[PDB]
């Protein structure tokens, strides 16, 4: 029955992927961002300039007030609101209805985006990072406890405006090719993983692998970019600059601020290297790698001019809170969040990115010694 969830995600580039949901009785329809990087289910519940619609608790006969406030600070944006519960469904999802916690967003700062088409966020990570504390059961935990939906979901995020699939409760084999390779979930709070090696165009970055996971590495469908710790970012940018030194780019391009453009269909993809991230595997001393093409980390953006020139932004930025494998990394891969077996699987997606001489890949097995030493403490 997973076919009913294929292509249930939509979005705008750089603005997250959302799924349609209903809350309350009678059902109120809202578009909800799917976020594996947090654990709160929250919806706009008061007028806002950028909200087309919002949750009206007064119109729901199943709404229950929890008489408790809540706020969530993300990297840049934040919101605050009122906790409560209500019945929730996913129209293009499993045929079930659950009573879930909902944060009714009453005030926000740089959270909603002008013209985004979504009105809320579904944090799919674990209770340990839920606000106000881990006693607020996340949506997916409520779904698994109250229904027979198996304890796993999978995400197929597709590039170019954009679409994808969130398969709730399983793996849809028509969404990927080749084999699924699994990496352990290190700890159940974020979807934390361990990166054991990094190569750019086949060249090992030759850093202490602890640097790749300082102070954690997570899989986060709610963050656009690949975010890298300071030392790793500097090494990666230095290598990417040298590989593409054929052309010159404004220094603001490398900061993710400015954009670069080329004549329609002349982007010099060949001068940009591939990035290989090696993840800890399931057996002793075994890893696997995922290979990232420049079509993933050069995010296409609309040019505000009359030009019909392909313009892009550098979708790799510096982090001070560890590695973030964001949406641009997940795109072109089918990613299985196998909560039941505490593992995350990667396979080449049915909507993979196309280069002419290169291809995104998930390859294994590799031998990697002392992988346990790569986790930060
Ligand atoms: C830095 O650049 C960033 C940051 C974020 C998003 C993006 N770009 N682009 C995508 C924007 C799409 C929509 C969006 C807006 C606001 C918040 C989020 C999406 C979720 C948040 C994730 O939840 C973050 N996950 C990790 C994290 C970080 C801090 C605190 C917590 C707590 C709440 C658990 C969790 N995304 C971002 O903050």
Curated annotation (Swiss-Prot):
Keyword Oxidoreductase among UniProt keywords: no
Subcellular location: Cell membrane; Golgi apparatus, trans-Golgi network; Endoplasmic reticulum; Endosome
Keywords, comma-separated and alphabetical: Acetylation, Aspartyl protease, Cell membrane, Cell projection, Cytoplasmic vesicle, Disulfide bond, Endoplasmic reticulum, Endosome, Glycoprotein, Golgi apparatus, Hydrolase, Isopeptide bond, Lipoprotein, Lysosome, Membrane, Palmitate, Phosphoprotein, Protease, Signal, Transmembrane, Transmembrane helix, Ubl conjugation, Zymogen
Membrane topology: Single-pass type I membrane protein
A Gene Ontology term for the protein's cellular component: late endosome
Annotated tissue distribution: Expressed at high levels in the brain and pancreas. In the brain, expression is highest in the substantia nigra, locus coruleus and medulla oblongata.
Any single biological process term in GO: positive regulation of neuron apoptotic process
PTM summary: N-Glycosylated. Addition of a bisecting N-acetylglucosamine by MGAT3 blocks lysosomal targeting, further degradation and is required for maintaining stability under stress conditions. Acetylated in the endoplasmic reticulum at Lys-68, Lys-206, Lys-210, Lys-216, Lys-230, Lys-231 and Lys-238. Acetylation by NAT8 and NAT8B is transient and deacetylation probably occurs in the Golgi. Acetylation regulates the maturation, the transport to the plasma membrane, the stability and the expression of the protein.
Entry-listed glycosylation sites: 95, 114, 285
Entry keyword Zinc: no
Residues recorded as bearing N6-acetyllysine in the entry: 68, 206, 210, 216, 230-231, 238
Record domain Peptidase A1: where: 17-347
UniProt induction comment: Up-regulated by the Ca(2+)-regulated transcription factor NFATC4.
Activity control mechanisms: Inhibited by RTN3 and RTN4.
Catalytic reaction equation(s): Broad endopeptidase specificity. Cleaves Glu-Val-Asn-Leu-|-Asp-Ala-Glu-Phe in the Swedish variant of Alzheimer's amyloid precursor protein
Disulfide linkage: 158-351, 209-374, 261-311
Active-site positions on this chain: 35, 220
EC number: 3.4.23.46
UniProt GO MF annotations: amyloid-beta binding; aspartic-type endopeptidase activity; beta-aspartyl-peptidase activity; endopeptidase activity; enzyme binding; peptidase activity; protein serine/threonine kinase binding
Extracellular side: 1-377
Principal location listed in the UniProt entry: membrane
Domain remarks in the Swiss-Prot or TrEMBL record: DXXLL motif is required for a proper endocytosis and retrograde transport to the trans-Golgi network, as well as for regulation of lysosomal degradation. The transmembrane domain is necessary for its activity. It determines its late Golgi localization and access to its substrate, APP.
Family assignment from sequence similarity: Belongs to the peptidase A1 family.
Subunit structure of this chain's protein: Monomer. Interacts with RTN1; RTN2; RTN3 and RTN4; the interaction leads to inhibition of amyloid precursor protein processing. Interacts with SNX6. Interacts with PCSK9. Interacts with NAT8 and NAT8B. Interacts with BIN1. Interacts (via extracellular domain) with ADAM10 (via extracellular domain). Interacts with SORL1; this interaction may affect binding with APP and hence reduce APP cleavage. Interacts with NRDC AND NRG1.
Function: Responsible for the proteolytic processing of the amyloid precursor protein (APP). Cleaves at the N-terminus of the A-beta peptide sequence, between residues 671 and 672 of APP, leads to the generation and extracellular release of beta-cleaved soluble APP, and a corresponding cell-associated C-terminal fragment which is later released by gamma-secretase. Cleaves CHL1.
Protein name according to UniProt: Beta-secretase 1
Organism: Homo sapiens
Lineage, highest ranks first: Eukaryota, Metazoa, Chordata, Craniata, Vertebrata
Gene name of the encoded protein: BACE1
Residues of the full protein shown: 59 to 446 of 501
